[PDB]
Write an enzyme that holds these catalytic residues in place. Structure first.
Site, PDB file in Angstrom:
ATOM      1  N   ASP A   1      14.988 -30.872 -40.908  1.00 48.21           N
ATOM      2  CA  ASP A   1      15.436 -30.073 -39.861  1.00 48.21           C
ATOM      3  C   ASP A   1      16.824 -30.100 -40.132  1.00 48.21           C
ATOM      4  OD1 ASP A   1      16.888 -30.032 -37.276  1.00 48.21           O
ATOM      5  OD2 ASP A   1      15.034 -29.663 -36.394  1.00 48.21           O
TER       6      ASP A   1
ATOM      7  N   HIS B   1      16.728 -36.358 -32.811  1.00 50.23           N
ATOM      8  CA  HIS B   1      18.312 -36.897 -32.117  1.00 50.23           C
ATOM      9  C   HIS B   1      18.148 -37.880 -31.486  1.00 50.23           C
ATOM     10  CE1 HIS B   1      20.118 -33.298 -33.918  1.00 50.23           C
ATOM     11  NE2 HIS B   1      19.402 -32.638 -33.178  1.00 50.23           N
TER      12      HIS B   1
ATOM     13  N   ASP C   1      14.288 -25.116 -38.743  1.00 50.35           N
ATOM     14  CA  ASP C   1      15.704 -24.452 -38.211  1.00 50.35           C
ATOM     15  C   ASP C   1      16.556 -24.102 -39.508  1.00 50.35           C
ATOM     16  OD1 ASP C   1      15.597 -27.137 -38.171  1.00 50.35           O
ATOM     17  OD2 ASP C   1      16.366 -27.161 -35.878  1.00 50.35           O
TER      18      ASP C   1
ATOM     19  N   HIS D   1      19.473 -29.806 -38.704  1.00 54.29           N
ATOM     20  CA  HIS D   1      20.499 -30.580 -37.685  1.00 54.29           C
ATOM     21  C   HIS D   1      20.195 -32.188 -38.158  1.00 54.29           C
ATOM     22  CE1 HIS D   1      19.395 -27.024 -35.210  1.00 54.29           C
ATOM     23  NE2 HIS D   1      20.604 -26.902 -35.454  1.00 54.29           N
TER      24      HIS D   1
HETATM   25  C1  LIG Z   1      26.278 -24.042 -23.909  1.00 54.73           C
HETATM   26  O1  LIG Z   1      26.577 -25.162 -24.386  1.00 54.73           O
HETATM   27  C2  LIG Z   1      25.762 -25.505 -25.369  1.00 54.73           C
HETATM   28  O2  LIG Z   1      25.559 -25.041 -26.343  1.00 54.73           O
HETATM   29  C3  LIG Z   1      24.916 -26.872 -25.114  1.00 54.73           C
HETATM   30  C4  LIG Z   1      25.595 -28.105 -24.435  1.00 54.73           C
HETATM   31  C5  LIG Z   1      26.735 -28.638 -25.402  1.00 54.73           C
HETATM   32  C6  LIG Z   1      28.188 -28.135 -25.213  1.00 54.73           C
HETATM   33  C7  LIG Z   1      29.031 -28.565 -26.087  1.00 54.73           C
HETATM   34  C8  LIG Z   1      28.898 -29.634 -27.143  1.00 54.73           C
HETATM   35 BR1  LIG Z   1      30.192 -29.969 -28.164  1.00 54.73          BR
HETATM   36  C9  LIG Z   1      27.614 -29.905 -27.427  1.00 54.73           C
HETATM   37  C10 LIG Z   1      26.680 -29.375 -26.613  1.00 54.73           C
HETATM   38  N1  LIG Z   1      24.341 -27.319 -26.364  1.00 54.73           N
HETATM   39  C11 LIG Z   1      23.131 -27.638 -26.810  1.00 54.73           C
HETATM   40  O3  LIG Z   1      22.189 -27.447 -25.823  1.00 54.73           O
HETATM   41  C12 LIG Z   1      22.847 -28.104 -27.982  1.00 54.73           C
HETATM   42  C13 LIG Z   1      21.275 -28.316 -28.429  1.00 54.73           C
HETATM   43  C14 LIG Z   1      21.012 -28.794 -29.744  1.00 54.73           C
HETATM   44  C15 LIG Z   1      20.207 -27.940 -30.522  1.00 54.73           C
HETATM   45  C16 LIG Z   1      19.720 -28.726 -31.781  1.00 54.73           C
HETATM   46  C17 LIG Z   1      18.112 -28.899 -31.528  1.00 54.73           C
HETATM   47  C18 LIG Z   1      17.680 -28.973 -32.909  1.00 54.73           C
HETATM   48  O4  LIG Z   1      16.669 -28.366 -33.314  1.00 54.73           O
HETATM   49  N2  LIG Z   1      17.843 -30.372 -33.671  1.00 54.73           N
HETATM   50  O5  LIG Z   1      17.401 -30.818 -34.570  1.00 54.73           O
HETATM   51  K   LIG Z   2      18.198 -33.132 -40.792  1.00 53.05           K
HETATM   52 ZN   LIG Z   3      17.025 -28.967 -35.615  1.00 55.05          ZN
END
Ligand SMILES: COC(=O)[C@H](Cc1ccc(Br)cc1)NC(=O)CCCCCCC(=O)NO
Ligand SMILES: [K+]
Ligand SMILES: [Zn+2]
Ligand SMILES: COC(=O)[C@H](Cc1ccc(Br)cc1)NC(=O)CCCCCCC(=O)NO
Ligand SMILES: [Cl-]
Ligand SMILES: [K+]
Ligand SMILES: [K+]
Ligand SMILES: [K+]
Ligand SMILES: [Zn+2]
Ligand SMILES: [Zn+2]
Lengths: 368, 375
Positions: free
Chosen positions: B186, B149, B274, B188
């Site tokens: 992955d 990312h 994942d 994502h």
């Molecule tokens: C409670 O709010 C959340 O869910 C938090 C913050 C967030 C809130 C809104 C959005 Br649109 C995006 C992110 N989101 C995250 O922490 C997203 C983590 C990404 C997970 C993916 C990791 C991975 O395996 N990447 O390959």
């Molecule tokens: K990927």
């Molecule tokens: Zn991932």
């Protein structure tokens, strides 16, 4: 309106061992883990959210009463009940039969309180003392068939409650709507031949148990047409679930005219659950609960009892569960803090395969 | 046992990879006003990857691996993939008394957290270097924090530096490879890796991912690179519920043809798990056997086209129960030592994902025309 709420401390003490799902297995090289999949913490966090959110102030706490042998026998064989006594009496408990579902010594106590929580809430909602309720029970129930424990389930809580409403409260028809993501094979088994309990399961097709929950499973004899499985494809989200509600479930309930609707309320269809591939959000469950409560209001004087089933996201389950509770109380005090993160992931468009899976079930309504 | 059938297979695990402080939150921070109860295991808690390492060891696989020490990625290493501003910001955040927010409000580094970020990136680099010299034929760098990312100018989604891009940058600049492929499976979108190599045809970036899972509004098949790099980014967004069949169809119809067309001198795999059947952070249905088959295909491809030079670099994956077995399966494909079953195989085998659905076929078919533009 008075909304009953059951949480017993022991619900959070159910011992899920040191394995992930099966036990830690050294020869398999399954490293011990401190948080089993089925760890009681997820449900405890739901309870704690009910409290910390202030929902508990709008709720009428109802003490669980231990389900008696009489209660249990309304849903289960004498052999199963004996076996659970046997297993719980073992020095350190043991295998309830499936090699997975464990009961510790004296664990029957918790199993009785779980089923009995559903019963006590059902009793009080049926007297008109309460309008509705949520029994946040543990261990879960819907996998326990007439003659066994299975899939973390010792007794079929909702079936024990239904059997109580039938036998003790004299209700002629009871519906169990099970939206835990897994097939309620246990509930289906118990009421298989019996048209006086309509059993509906929404589930991810073949998620658990294996080879179970096909829509062709419709009951037998007098009970034929009174079991409805709605197997849904992995990736089904709010759109598919609400379509299932609107096309199948609510018509089914309306057709059947239960005196009581019991919801086997799991949250393992949630977007974040490890134990299925569904995309339901707290708002999806909110809408599902809202629809069912409204249906109950229309068709059976609002008599509806939610009973906790599965769900394995300690992060997200509490907000899914809270959303249901808020629909019961009508007090909406907290956002789903994950809503933004999950809102763009999908699941809110009814896909053709989702639609097709649900349409398969619509002809079955005719036989209610 | 001292007569082996594999060449030297590199393996990177550094203790600090398991020490990444993920804090007390679930995903974002535990937040009292939102009534997000604190939790002992953050979704991205390092234990999941540690359990993968311990299974590598406890299974005996480690005996068929060549342990390779991570070396800290230098400023020069990091700078081949990231801006001076990003590097400086990570230094700044890591120097804060208790560290802090890296920019996105979720990706945290404790004080001195930069040491681990350098070791993670450096683990990928070290392994890449040692495959490249021919000392090792291939390897798995079980790094943490993840990478994919992090774009040129930021940390994002738990990724401080883009480890595979750092490795690829090193392969390009230091090892003088002309072309490197990064295959990111992955679940994502590898938006960071995509960003870094956007304008550059010398690194082919491929991402398979659940469509719009994470990041939001990212990972469309129309994101193809720009300028001389146009045609050298390939996104394969897949529908939720996609399992082994979709993934392997993706491999067979898009990924392997892409790699064959491109002819990289080295394949780096951004290897997350994942997409597994039991992962909370996506809705995909890949089993350990699916990952095995993807790995087998990709290693065979590397054998065919770049002298077997393939470097797996750990990305995401959030099942502490199941990830170790997914990861083990991949490493077993590297060593050819298949010495442990997936104990979840039967439980998961009837769940599905093994039939290529029309929607899955269709999503993959969208990508096929893009192959025509590869080199
Ligand atoms: C409670 O709010 C959340 O869910 C938090 C913050 C967030 C809130 C809104 C959005 Br649109 C995006 C992110 N989101 C995250 O922490 C997203 C983590 C990404 C997970 C993916 C990791 C991975 O395996 N990447 O390959
Ligand atoms: K990927
Ligand atoms: Zn991932
Ligand atoms: C390592 O082996 C297992 O994973 C273990 C045993 C099992 C093994 C194979 C099969 Br085909 C079925 C079950 N699984 C289970 O017992 C499944 C129980 C969890 C799913 C039911 C929980 C739920 O929420 N039900 O609603
Ligand atoms: Cl060997
Ligand atoms: K029935
Ligand atoms: K169900
Ligand atoms: K590129
Ligand atoms: Zn369930
Ligand atoms: Zn060997």
């Amino acid at each position: 309106h008075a909304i009953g709420y059951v949480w017993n401390t022991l619900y959070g003490w159910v011992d899920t061992g040191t394995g992930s799902l099966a036990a830690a297995n050294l020869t398999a090289r399954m490293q011990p883990i401190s948080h089993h999949l089925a760890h009681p913490d997820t449900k405890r966090r739901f309870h704690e959210l009910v409290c910390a959110s202030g929902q508990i102030e709008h709720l009428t706490p109802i003490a669980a009463v231990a389900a008696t042998d009489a209660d249990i026998l309304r849903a289960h064989s004498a052999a199963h009940l004996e076996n659970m006594k046997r297993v719980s009496n073992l020095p350190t408990g043991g295998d309830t039969g499936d090699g997975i579902t464990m009961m510790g010594n004296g664990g029957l106590e918790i199993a009785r309180l779980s089923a009995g929580g559903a019963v006590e809430l059902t009793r009080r909602v049926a007297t008109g003392e309460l309008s509705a309720g949520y029994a946040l029970v543990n261990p879960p129930g819907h996998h326990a068939p007439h003659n066994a424990a299975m899939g973390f389930c010792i007794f079929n809580n909702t079936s024990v409650a239904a059997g109580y409403a039938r036998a003790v409260l004299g209700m002629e028809r009871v519906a169990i709507l099970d939206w835990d993501v897994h097939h309620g094979n246990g509930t289906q088994d118990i009421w298989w031949n019996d048209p006086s309990v309509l059993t509906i399961s929404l589930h991810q097709h073949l998620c658990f148990p294996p080879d179970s929950g096909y829509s062709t499973e419709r009951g037998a004899g007098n009970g034929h047409g009174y079991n409805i499985n709605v197997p849904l494809p992995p990736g089904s989200g709010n759109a598919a679930y609400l379509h299932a509600m609107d096309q199948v479930v609510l018509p089914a309930l309306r057709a059947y005219r239960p005196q009581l609707i019991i919801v086997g309320s799991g949250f393992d269809a949630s977007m974040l659950d490890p134990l299925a591939r569904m995309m339901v959000t707290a708002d999806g469950f909110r809408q599902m609960a809202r629809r069912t409560i409204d249906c109950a209001a229309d068709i059976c004087d609002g008599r509806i009892v939610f009973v906790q089933e599965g769900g394995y996201s300690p992060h997200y389950l509490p907000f899914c569960g809270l959303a249901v509770i808020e629909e019961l109380t009508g007090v909406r005090s907290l956002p789903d803090p994950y809503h933004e993160f999950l809102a763009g992931m999908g699941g809110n468009t009814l896909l053709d395969a989702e639609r097709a899976a649900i349409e398969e079930i619509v002809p079955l309504l005719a036989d209610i």
